């Protein structure tokens, strides 16, 4: 970045690269050694990948080299926190949280059901026996 009267002072990283945008060679004339310039330029000309704010649903971006990482709030997941955990209550997802049977209802909430000899609890997800010896329970242990 050249501007006549501003090019009278000697080399400076703060003036040419921090306050202004410098080229590879300008940076090279500052560091002189190749490997030094190398590791400065490597991150310098990389670009802030979080500048476009890719982390949805209130997430936080942290820039990396030619990439970023999204830190999501509790209810979200995904590379960009795009996935809502609250919109995943379906039967293929850990049995919809049902203790026994689960029934999908697209558009509405899924419902939980129970095996014969059991009945659905208050919560709408747990089952309780309605007979003395319900199936699948080992009495001598309880």
């Amino acid at each position: 970045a050249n501007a006549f009267l501003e090019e009278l002072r000697p080399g400076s990283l703060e003036r040419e690269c921090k306050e202004e945008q410098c080229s590879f060679e300008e940076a090279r004339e500052i560091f002189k050694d190749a490997e030094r310039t190398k590791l400065f330029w490597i991150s310098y000309s990389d670009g802030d990948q979080c500048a476009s704010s890719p982390c949805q649903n209130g997430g936080s971006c942290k820039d990396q080299l030619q990439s970023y990482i999204c830190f999501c709030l509790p209810a979200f997941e995904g590379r960009n926190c795009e996935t809502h955990k609250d919109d995943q209550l379906i039967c293929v997802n850990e049995n919809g949280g049902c203790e026994q049977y689960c029934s999908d209802h697209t558009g509405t909430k899924r419902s939980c059901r129970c095996h014969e000899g059991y009945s659905l609890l208050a919560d709408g997800v747990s089952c309780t026996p309605t007979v003395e010896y319900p199936c699948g329970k080992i009495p001598i242990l309880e």
Partner: protein, 191 residues
């Protein structure tokens, strides 16, 4: 349906995403993940994506060894066609993120260089844990300045010649590793 191939683990600071091929044509995918003796958990149900975020599963125990599989289902809705992924142990395989130099203070004829706490996706007690909270003594930070310094914390107390202006750069390193021992260098910051 066709089976998914080139299943790969992309992980940095425990944000772990499984990726695969091919782009689906008349088929959707479902991902399962488990520990060698645990139950399979389903994720990314009937997705058309060729990736799946598994961060929330692996951060339950970063030292466990996980295996994932990608089910292929036909468009519309007998075990499905699937492919298994390489096993993945987060603590031994997650990439160390690019560090950032927080500050440098000339405290006397010495300069203290502070490395910003790298946060990970592991969130013990509401907050995200740093790399040091997870690795402890397994993690060290190395400084390349102008030559080399190493630390068991996030600070370097280095000797400098008065009024000379040095340049610094840091790297997260897990010395016990043989593969993927270190992070990419941090942006260079000079006095």
């Amino acid at each position: 349906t066709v089976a998914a191939y080139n299943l790969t683990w992309k992980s940095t600071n425990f944000k772990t995403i499984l990726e695969w091929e091919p782009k689906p044509v008349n088929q959707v995918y479902t991902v399962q993940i488990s520990t060698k003796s645990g139950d399979w958990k389903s994720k990314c149900f009937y997705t058309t994506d060729t990736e799946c975020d598994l961060t929330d599963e692996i951060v339950k125990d970063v030292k466990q060894t996980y295996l994932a599989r990608v089910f292929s289902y036909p468009a519309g809705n007998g075990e499905p066609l699937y492919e298994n992924s390489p096993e993945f142990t987060p603590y031994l395989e997650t990439n160390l993120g690019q560090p950032t130099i927080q500050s440098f203070e000339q405290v006397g004829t010495k300069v203290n260089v502070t490395v910003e706490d790298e946060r990970t996706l592991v969130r013990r007690n509401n907050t995200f844990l740093s790399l040091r909270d997870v690795f402890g003594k397994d993690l060290i930070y190395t400084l390349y300045y102008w030559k080399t310094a190493k630390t068991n914390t996030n600070e370097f107390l280095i000797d400098v010649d008065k009024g000379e202006n040095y340049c610094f750069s840091v790297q997260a390193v897990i010395p016990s590793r043989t593969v993927n021992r270190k992070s990419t260098d941090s942006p260079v910051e000079c006095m």
